[PDB]
From Swiss-Prot, chain A:
Family: Belongs to the mitochondrion-specific ribosomal protein mL50 family.
Function noted in UniProt: Component of the mitochondrial ribosome (mitoribosome), a dedicated translation machinery responsible for the synthesis of mitochondrial genome-encoded proteins, including at least some of the essential transmembrane subunits of the mitochondrial respiratory chain. The mitoribosomes are attached to the mitochondrial inner membrane and translation products are cotranslationally integrated into the membrane.
Gene that specifies this protein: MRPL13
Protein name (record): Large ribosomal subunit protein mL50
Subunit architecture: Component of the mitochondrial large ribosomal subunit (mt-LSU). Mature yeast 74S mitochondrial ribosomes consist of a small (37S) and a large (54S) subunit. The 37S small subunit contains a 15S ribosomal RNA (15S mt-rRNA) and 34 different proteins. The 54S large subunit contains a 21S rRNA (21S mt-rRNA) and 46 different proteins.
General remark: Present with 1350 molecules/cell in log phase SD medium.
Species name: Saccharomyces cerevisiae (strain ATCC 204508 / S288c)
From Swiss-Prot, chain B:
Note: Present with 1800 molecules/cell in log phase SD medium.
Covered residues, full protein: 156 to 309 of 309
A Gene Ontology term for the protein's cellular component: mitochondrial large ribosomal subunit
Name the record gives this protein: Large ribosomal subunit protein uL22m
Main location: mitochondrion
Keywords tagged on the record: Mitochondrion, Ribonucleoprotein, Ribosomal protein, Transit peptide
Subunit structure: Component of the mitochondrial large ribosomal subunit (mt-LSU). Mature yeast 74S mitochondrial ribosomes consist of a small (37S) and a large (54S) subunit. The 37S small subunit contains a 15S ribosomal RNA (15S mt-rRNA) and 34 different proteins. The 54S large subunit contains a 21S rRNA (21S mt-rRNA) and 46 different proteins. uL22m forms the wall of the exit tunnel.
Annotated source species: Saccharomyces cerevisiae (strain ATCC 204508 / S288c) (Baker's yeast)
Example of a GO MF term: structural constituent of ribosome
Biological role stated in the UniProt entry: Component of the mitochondrial ribosome (mitoribosome), a dedicated translation machinery responsible for the synthesis of mitochondrial genome-encoded proteins, including at least some of the essential transmembrane subunits of the mitochondrial respiratory chain. The mitoribosomes are attached to the mitochondrial inner membrane and translation products are cotranslationally integrated into the membrane.
Curated annotation (Swiss-Prot), chain C:
Originating organism: Saccharomyces cerevisiae (strain ATCC 204508 / S288c)
Keyword presence, Cell membrane: no
Subcellular location: Mitochondrion
Whole-protein coverage range: 44 to 161 of 161
Taxonomic lineage: Eukaryota, Fungi, Dikarya, Ascomycota, Saccharomycotina
Keywords, sorted A to Z: Mitochondrion, Ribonucleoprotein, Ribosomal protein, Transit peptide
Note: Present with 1850 molecules/cell in log phase SD medium.
Record protein name field: Large ribosomal subunit protein bL21m
Gene Ontology cellular component terms for the protein in this record: mitochondrial inner membrane; mitochondrial large ribosomal subunit; mitochondrion
Keyword set includes Ribonucleoprotein: yes
Family label: Belongs to the bacterial ribosomal protein bL21 family.
From Swiss-Prot, chain D:
Role, per record: Component of the mitochondrial ribosome (mitoribosome), a dedicated translation machinery responsible for the synthesis of mitochondrial genome-encoded proteins, including at least some of the essential transmembrane subunits of the mitochondrial respiratory chain. The mitoribosomes are attached to the mitochondrial inner membrane and translation products are cotranslationally integrated into the membrane.
Upper taxonomic lineage: Eukaryota, Fungi, Dikarya, Ascomycota, Saccharomycotina
An MF annotation (GO) of this entry: structural constituent of ribosome
Other observations noted: Present with 350 molecules/cell in log phase SD medium.
Family from the record: Belongs to the mitochondrion-specific ribosomal protein mL58 family.
Name this protein carries in UniProt: Large ribosomal subunit protein mL58
Species for this entry: Saccharomyces cerevisiae (strain ATCC 204508 / S288c)
Tree of life domain: Eukaryota
Keywords for the protein's UniProt record, in alphabetical order: Mitochondrion, Ribonucleoprotein, Ribosomal protein, Transit peptide
Subunit structure and binding partners: Component of the mitochondrial large ribosomal subunit (mt-LSU). Mature yeast 74S mitochondrial ribosomes consist of a small (37S) and a large (54S) subunit. The 37S small subunit contains a 15S ribosomal RNA (15S mt-rRNA) and 34 different proteins. The 54S large subunit contains a 21S rRNA (21S mt-rRNA) and 46 different proteins.
A biological process term (GO) from this entry: mitochondrial translation
GO cellular component: mitochondrial inner membrane; mitochondrial large ribosomal subunit; mitochondrion
InterPro entries the record matches: Ribosomal_mL58
RNA sequence: AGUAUGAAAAUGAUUAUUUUAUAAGCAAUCAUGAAUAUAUUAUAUUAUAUUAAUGAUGUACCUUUUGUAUAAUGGGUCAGC
RNA sequence: AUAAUAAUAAUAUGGUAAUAGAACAUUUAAUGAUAAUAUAUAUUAGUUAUUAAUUAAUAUAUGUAUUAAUUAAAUAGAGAA
């Protein structure tokens, strides 16, 4: 389990091992959140329009 | 690019003839205008010719249906495949000798493209190539082929 | 030895010999030595201490190691790479076994950076 | 000048029978020192300092005084090639303004009767000069162009290609 | 008249300055996988650090991937050598790395007999001519 | 909802933006790519890593309305709005100026009396945009071809981002063979060129006082070291006339072409050697398959000799009387 | 002789690139022009790939033999066993 | 007092019948992470002194290895009947 800190030199670095599943999941979650937000806003706007 | 230029693809049914026989005729219809090809077929005294003509007609019809005008269509290429399941029969000869007769069945496929686009494009390409062509120079700088040797000979 | 007409010219070639193998170069050329150097690494610079012949279009200085005083010819090492891999197949004429003789010799690549009169 | 020994690019082998063989040249070795080896080659595409003529060097460049753009050939012997008549017998500026005007007028009037050659014959002067002086009626030019076009059309396939090749060659031969 | 026909300059890597041909090296390995044991050892062993110290113009990435262990190396010219170091030990891996570093990125290629020099400079002396020879033929 | 992933991402983005605005020194130092670049080109140590980072950062203020049409070809999701006072825009201009000056000067030194057009061409060859881009590529200045979101997902620090080149690059610009034609600002090559120029500018800035010629030396090592055969740049209309004019201008006898040697007349491929004499001084040798051709070649050779004259450093700076005009 | 799938080869037709109608032999190897194709570092005077200009070199493979280009044995090609 | 790698000097490295030593491919059993950004197979171009594996692009599967590696074994490798 190496890190960029372990190699005592600026040129050497370790790219982060973030599983390609976890990342995907995160992305999905973000998308969902966005949907919840934007859609909600749209709904609100619609309601406002209906009102007046 | 090749695929995009407007084409029509026509296929025969299971012709009862041998590939060789077919190709005997098909060699004649190489880059012919469809109508000309059809005419040729009409008058060719070979059994396969009828079917070929029919196929060509069908192709023309398809072209008409889908956008293209008969007088623009030429045979871009046309070929013979063996069709499926040829049935082998034994053919008994004198003494105990045995031949095995096989009854071949083929199919003719053609691709018709258009003189308006495809042919024009190829002509253009040819022209370009010609333009590119370096001239024959009398004292042309022909490279001194061979390795030098690390030593001047001049 | 009056070395003025070499001094005055703009184009100049040299025929230096590494391990007696003569290479004829101008500045900016890439010499492909057919062996691996251990003395020099990549990025190092070699001052050629054996130059058989310096030459302009019409004049040429010559001599068995001509004085290092007279010229400066120095090459930088760029690459140590091998020439492409080959399997020449060795066999006799009624013998089923074959001996695959593999070959991937090594090259050192130089670049003639400086080539001048001193 | 320099008093160097001069040499051919020598081979230990027979030059007549084996000049392309590199090994011979390699084998040959000459006594240490300076040498003069005249280049066995024309200096057409070259930009080498030992190729430039003294007249094109600045009056300061040390190479002027030195002797290595050698004048081996002598101009007395070499025949004039593709030269104008004005070069063989010097240029003349005899023709006045009135005469010039007249010539111009003539050109304007009848190009087929008073063609360039005819004009030249009349006034002891070059066709080129006449051309420079005076433009012919544009109609005539147009006609000529048309004729040229017709001629071109009349060509076969091969000839056109040949012409093109020739043109290309011509273009090339000013690169150097 | 004089008309200019366009052209571009050709880079000669070593004549002025010298850019170092190798730029990045990616040590690729796997936690699970006996083939990647030597690589793992190498990664562990301060050798990498030493290498970094030696050669700071070239950067060392260290990836974690499920397959065999690799040393993909990236060069100035653009090309990328890739050496799978399946089942090698520490020293062999190091040697491989060294090899990678030494090479310029250029593709491998068969050389003919004695094809040594490679110039883009017009011959100092001219190309021989029959008419401008010192010795005429017969 | 134990995790607000949109919030975290937003925070990350903000941080990135802040870093870009600053280009903090520590962060720059931490970046490996930048360090490698610095080592590679043997840059002077007065040049900081922040400066280097800045050089790689092209001016990207406001996201265009061309983004809103990914359906119409283009989408810009890689970049993050740059600081207006901390871009490479200023440096770039300076770099360009330097290139224009110095390269040109060098060319002049090499070849006095180089026809203006030819000189211009040479200059372009030395420092055209494409060439500069190529140089940049060689150096290893890579482009930020990864979306911010993607980066976040990966969980890579800002150092890496800093190390990369940063401009409004069209993600999805050559997919399915469709290329959205845009201005100079959105081309990769241009960006690369700018970066190159910026580096030079930076160098100049750092070494303006301690060692003024350092920048020039660097340029020579990198830009002027590149081979260009000046002989390949010329193309003459009717050179004979020009030659004659030149002769007239100078103190030379009128030039005359003359046959020196001839072989294979009456053949497919003959050889005619004609020299252009001015009295006795041969002014240009010229070979040809025809006489006319040979003559032309001779003239061309003469012209080349006149122009591409390369005087020594021991000479006193020679200044030509411009180009011959006819 | 299950059902799906199948860019496995041999084999046929066709198209493209290229070479080919003064040239003679295991059809390859090495040298070496030229033409074409591809290449998001061809910066090019670039690199690879394809291709019977041209030159040199070159008696198929196995078996059995003192010894095989042999006009001694064996094999039509490919796939499976 | 070992192993791995690298040096220096030296000696040795044709080979039928034959002897000796060391590897690789394929398939099955024991142990066994991982993942559609993954894998398997195929084509093309690279890479590693290369019957092998790996990289990139491409095509087809497949919610995914009897996968890496060490053992155990073999219906374990075919132009020769
Ligand atoms: Mg079927
Ligand atoms: Mg009967
Ligand atoms: Mg039969
Ligand atoms: Mg025997
Ligand atoms: Mg054998
Ligand atoms: Mg002989
Ligand atoms: Mg024999
Ligand atoms: Mg038989
Ligand atoms: Mg042995
Ligand atoms: Mg078996
Ligand atoms: Mg088999
Ligand atoms: Mg076999």
């Amino acid at each position: 389990h190496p890190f960029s800190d372990n190699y005592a030199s600026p040129n050497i670095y370790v790219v982060n091992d973030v599983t390609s599943k976890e990342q995907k999941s995160k992305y999905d979650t973000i998308m969902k959140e966005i949907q919840k937000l934007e859609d909600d806003a749209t709904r609100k706007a619609l309601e406002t329009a209906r009102s007046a | 690019i090749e695929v995009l230029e407007p084409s029509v693809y026509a296929q025969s049914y299971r012709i009862k003839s041998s590939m060789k026989k077919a190709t005997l005729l098909l060699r004649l219809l190489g880059g012919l205008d469809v109508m000309k090809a059809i005419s040729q077929c009409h008058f060719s005294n070979k059994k396969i010719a009828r079917e070929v003509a029919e196929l060509l007609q069908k192709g023309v019809k398809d072209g008409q249906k889908l956008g293209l005008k008969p007088e623009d269509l030429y045979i871009s290429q046309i070929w013979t495949g063996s069709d499926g399941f040829w049935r082998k029969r034994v053919e008994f000869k004198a003494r105990t000798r045995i031949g095995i007769i096989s009854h071949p069945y083929i199919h003719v496929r053609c691709i018709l493209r258009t003189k308006s686009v495809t042919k024009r494009r190829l002509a253009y390409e040819a022209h370009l190539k010609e333009q590119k062509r370096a001239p024959w120079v009398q004292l042309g700088d022909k490279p001194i082929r061979g390795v030098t040797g690390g030593v001047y000979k001049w | 030895t009056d070395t003025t007409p070499l001094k005055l010219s703009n184009e100049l070639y040299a025929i230096f010999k590494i391990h007696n193998r003569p290479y004829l170069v101008t500045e900016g050329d890439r010499v492909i030595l057919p062996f691996k150097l251990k003395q020099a690494e990549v990025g190092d610079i070699l001052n050629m201490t054996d130059v058989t012949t310096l030459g302009s279009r019409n004049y040429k200085l010559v001599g068995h190691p001509i004085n290092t005083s007279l010229y400066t010819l120095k090459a930088t090492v760029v690459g140590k790479t091998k020439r492409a891999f080959q399997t020449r197949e060795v066999t006799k004429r009624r013998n089923r076994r074959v001996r695959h003789a593999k070959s991937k010799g090594d090259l050192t690549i130089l670049r003639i950076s400086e080539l001048s009169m001193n | 000048q320099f008093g160097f020994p001069k040499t051919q690019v020598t081979t230990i082998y027979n030059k007549t029978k084996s000049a392309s063989n590199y090994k011979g040249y390699l084998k040959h070795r000459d006594a240490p020192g300076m040498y003069y080896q005249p280049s066995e080659s024309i200096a057409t595409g070259s930009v080498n300092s030992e190729t430039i003529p003294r007249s094109f060097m600045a009056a300061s460049d040390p190479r002027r005084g030195l002797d290595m753009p050698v004048q081996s050939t002598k101009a007395k012997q070499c025949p004039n090639v593709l030269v104008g008549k004005s070069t063989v017998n010097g240029k003349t500026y005899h023709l006045g303004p009135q005469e010039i005007d007249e010539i111009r007028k003539l050109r304007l009037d009848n190009p087929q009767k008073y063609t360039r050659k005819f004009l030249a014959a009349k006034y002891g002067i070059s066709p080129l000069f006449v051309s420079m002086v005076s433009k012919p009626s544009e109609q005539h030019v147009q006609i000529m162009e048309s004729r040229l076009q017709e001629i071109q059309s009349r060509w076969k396939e091969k000839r056109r290609i040949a012409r093109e090749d020739r043109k290309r060659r011509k273009l090339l031969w000013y690169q150097a | 008249v004089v008309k200019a026909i366009a052209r571009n300059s050709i880079g000669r890597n070593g004549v002025g300055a010298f850019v170092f041909p190798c730029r990045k090296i990616t040590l690729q390995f796997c936690n699970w996988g006996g083939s990647s044991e030597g690589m793992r050892k190498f990664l562990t062993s301060k050798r990498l650090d030493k290498w970094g110290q030696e050669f700071p113009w070239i950067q060392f990435e260290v990836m974690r991937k499920s397959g065999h262990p690799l040393l993909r190396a990236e060069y100035t010219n653009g090309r990328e050598k890739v050496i799978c170091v399946r089942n090698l030990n520490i020293d062999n891996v190091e040697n491989k790395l060294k090899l990678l570093k030494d090479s310029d990125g250029d593709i491998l290629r068969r050389r003919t007999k004695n094809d040594n020099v490679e110039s883009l400079n017009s011959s100092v002396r001219g190309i021989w001519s029959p008419l401008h020879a010192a010795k005429r033929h017969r | 909802l134990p995790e607000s992933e949109l919030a975290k991402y937003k925070e990350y983005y903000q941080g990135l933006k802040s870093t870009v605005n600053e280009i903090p020194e520590s962060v720059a130092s931490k970046s490996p790519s930048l360090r490698t670049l610095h080592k590679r080109l043997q840059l002077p140590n007065e040049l900081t890593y922040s400066t280097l980072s800045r050089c790689l950062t092209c001016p990207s203020a406001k996201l265009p309305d061309k983004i809103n049409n990914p359906t119409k070809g283009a989408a810009f999701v890689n970049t993050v709005p740059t600081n207006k006072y901390l871009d490479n825009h200023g440096l770039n201009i300076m770099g360009k100026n330097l290139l224009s000056y110095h390269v040109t000067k060098s060319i002049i030194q090499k070849y006095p009396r180089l026809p203006t057009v030819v000189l211009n061409a040479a200059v372009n060859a030395y420092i055209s945009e494409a060439v500069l881009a190529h140089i940049a590529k060689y150096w290893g200045i890579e482009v930020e071809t990864t979306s911010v979101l993607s980066r976040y997902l990966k969980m890579e620090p800002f150092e890496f981002t800093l190390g990369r080149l940063k401009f409004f690059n069209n993600s999805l610009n050559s997919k399915d063979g469709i290329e959205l034609i845009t201005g100079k600002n959105f081309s990769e090559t241009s960006a690369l060129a700018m970066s190159v120029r910026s580096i030079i500018a930076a160098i100049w800035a750092v070494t303006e006082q301690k060692d003024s010629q350092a920048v020039y030396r660097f340029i020579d090592d990198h830009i002027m070291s590149r081979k260009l055969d000046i002989t390949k740049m010329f193309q003459f209309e009717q050179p004979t006339r020009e030659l004659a004019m030149l002769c007239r201008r100078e103190g030379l006898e009128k030039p005359v072409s003359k046959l020196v040697a001839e072989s294979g007349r009456l053949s497919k491929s003959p050889v005619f050697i004609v020299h252009v004499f001015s009295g006795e001084e041969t002014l240009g040798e010229g070979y040809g398959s025809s006489l006319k051709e040979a003559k032309a070649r001779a003239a061309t050779d003469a012209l080349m000799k006149w122009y591409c004259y390369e005087p020594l450093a021991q000479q006193e700076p020679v200044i030509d009387p411009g180009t011959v005009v006819v």
